[PDB]
């Protein structure tokens, strides 16, 4: 049988190894309901892909632009040309409209599987969509799905889980030290016994609030550290 999440533990009845990356891990029994299990699988896939994109973006941004802090990169004054000091209202409007459209399409696909595959404007443009959360077609133009989709899906979910943990690590490292992941790694490599979680914890480098152009946005750390 497959290797579980712990030696000697017994996997739940609903976790028979059908989904990719199944380790029989469910201490809260949230997967007991099949509908809830499907929704949680979609949520896990979304979190995994978004976290992988965020981790890759933070790393590439720190490599290409080391003088820009990723935590404060959302400020309009830190945006690159020609988007510097741009109005955030129009930007939020653009993102809201586009993301709302794509997320409503994805949600409708979840509610009714295989019902929004066709393009609503140009008829005939459809995606195969063999499983929920795996549309394919235009989303996979390189044709990497015509093989062992199970092992590839396992690799995707495992890399996504690792990226989720890594992104939260980046967030807490930035909230406790005020620097990016590569900067924190270099600082720890300079003196491992002086720069670590033993001393960096308890201090919250994030300010109380920030005035984004006209309105103020409140900020806080994940733990009650010293401001």
Partner 1 sequence: LYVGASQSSLAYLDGSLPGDFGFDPLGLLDPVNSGGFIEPKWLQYSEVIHARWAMLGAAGCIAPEVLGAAGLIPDATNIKWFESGVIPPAGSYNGYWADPYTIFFVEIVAMQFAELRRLQDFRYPGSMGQQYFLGLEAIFKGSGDAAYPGGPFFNLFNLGKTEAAMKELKLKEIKNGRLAMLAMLGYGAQAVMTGKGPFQNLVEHLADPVNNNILTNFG
Q: Does 6 bind partner 1 (CB under 8 A)?
A: yes
Q: Do you know the residue count of the chain? A: 227
Here's the x/- map for partner 1, 8-27, by CB under 8 A: it reads as xxx-x-------------xx
Residue 161 backbone phi and psi in degrees, to 5? -65, -40
- What's the min distance (Å) between Cβ of 160 and partner 1? 22
Kind and range of the H or E element at 89?
helix 88-111
Site for partner 1 in 172-201 (CB under 8 A): 198
Selected range binding partner 1 among 3-11, 70-78, 99-107, 176-184, rule: CB under 8 A? 3-11
| Per-residue tokens: 192 | 């491992």
Cβ–Cβ under 8 Å, residues 167 and 51: yes
Residue 179's SS3 state is coil
Selected range binding partner 1 among 29-37, 61-69, 124-132, 184-192, rule: CB under 8 A? 29-37
Selected range binding partner 1 among 28-36, 53-61, 82-90, 100-108, rule: CB under 8 A? 28-36
Q: Does 224 bind partner 1 (CB under 8 A)?
A: yes
Distances (CA, A) of 107 to 22, 54, 111, 160: 24, 22, 6, 21
**Among 28, 121, 189, 215, which residue sits at the site for partner 1 (rule: CB under 8 A)?**
28
Query: What number of chain residues touch partner 1 (CB under 8 A)?
Result: 16
Residue 57's SS3 state is helix
Residue closest to 74 by CA, chosen among 59, 91, 90, 60: 91
Rounded to 10 degrees, the C-alpha dihedral 191/185/197/208 comes to 120
Here's the x/- map for partner 1, 197-216, by CB under 8 A: it reads as -x---x--------------
Site residues for partner 1 per CB under 8 A: 6, 8-10, 12, 26-30, 32-33, 36, 198, 202, 224
């Amino acid at each position: 049988d497959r290797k579980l999440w712990a030696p000697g533990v017994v996997a739940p009845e609903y976790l028979k190894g059908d989904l990719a990356g199944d380790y029989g891990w469910d201490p809260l029994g949230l997967g007991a309901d099949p509908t809830a299990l499907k929704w949680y699988r979609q949520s896990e896939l979304q979190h995994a892909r978004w976290a992988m994109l965020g981790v890759a973006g933070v790393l590439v941004q720190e490599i290409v632009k080391p003088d820009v802090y990723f935590y404060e990169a959302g400020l309009p004054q830190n945006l690159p040309e020609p988007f510097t000091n741009i109005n955030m209202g129009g930007l939020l409007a653009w993102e809201f409209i586009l993301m709302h459209w794509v997320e409503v399409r994805r949600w409708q696909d979840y509610k009714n599987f295989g019902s929004v595959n066709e393009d609503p404007i140009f008829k005939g443009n459809k995606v195969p969509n063999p499983e929920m959360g795996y549309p394919g077609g235009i989303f996979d133009p390189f044709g990497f799905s015509k093989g062992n989709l199970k092992e590839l899906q396992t690799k995707e979910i495992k890399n996504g889980r690792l990226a989720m943990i890594a992104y939260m690590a980046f967030i807490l490292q930035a909230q406790a030290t005020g620097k990016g992941p590569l900067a924190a790694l270099s600082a720890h490599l300079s003196n491992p016994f002086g720069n670590n979680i033993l001393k960096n914890i308890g201090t919250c480098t994030v300010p109380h609030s920030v005035d984004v152009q006209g309105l103020t946005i409140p900020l806080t750390c994940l733990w009650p550290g010293s401001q």
